[PDB]
Amino acid sequence: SEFGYIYRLAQDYLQSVLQIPSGPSKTSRVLQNVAFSVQKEVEKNLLDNVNVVSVDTARTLFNQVMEKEFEDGIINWGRIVTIFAFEGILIKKLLRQQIAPTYKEISYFVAEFIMNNTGEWIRQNGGWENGFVKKFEP
């Protein structure tokens, strides 16, 4: 439910990256706008010499990059938006390099990280609808 909210955010962001067909919530559309901006820059600043052949590789890649994104233990909405930006980067490299034909599997370990590492802060700072949306909405 709390997890299930973040899973929907992650699933929505995935469906937008893959350009897949109601409609996301305002919260989700606001997140997708800011996340895709960050994604464009992060993919720029980095990834080639690593082949994402498996969803277990993208999960392993995700933990490696995000444990470094939060090393100092400081968190803010900008860092949390970078989580979704990196999920989009891994989907793209997965779609290309998967030695295989998984939407659900990626949404899950993105939500697991957010829930298990930022859930308390997100709540204490307004949640998605009273903290993130209020800060990033037009």
Residues 133, 16, 94, 34, Cα dihedral to 10°: -30
Q: What is the DSSP string of the chain?
A: -HHHHHHHHHHHHHHHHTT------HHHHHHHHHHHHHHHHHHHH--TTS---SHHHHHHHHHHHHHHHTTT----HHHHHHHHHHHHHHHHHHHHH-S---HHHHHHHHHHHHHHHHHHHHHHTTHIIIIIHHHH--
Give the whole-angstrom CA distance, residue 33 versus residue 102.
Answer: 23
Q: Which domain holds residue 119?
A: 1-138
Q: Is residue 106 within 8 Å of residue 87, measured between CB atoms?
A: yes
CA-based angle 21:30:116, to the nearest 5? 90
Residue 15 makes CB contacts below 8 A (sequence gap 6+) with: 21, 103
Instruction: Say how many domains are in the chain.
Output: 1
Q: Is residue 13 within 8 Å of residue 88, measured between CB atoms?
A: yes
Give the whole-angstrom CA distance, residue 67 versus residue 117.
Answer: 10
**CATH code for the domain of 109:** 1.10.437.10
Give the whole-angstrom CA distance, residue 51 versus residue 122.
Answer: 33
Give the whole-angstrom CA distance, residue 2 versus residue 113.
Answer: 13
Q: Is residue 12 within 8 Å of residue 87, measured between CB atoms?
A: no
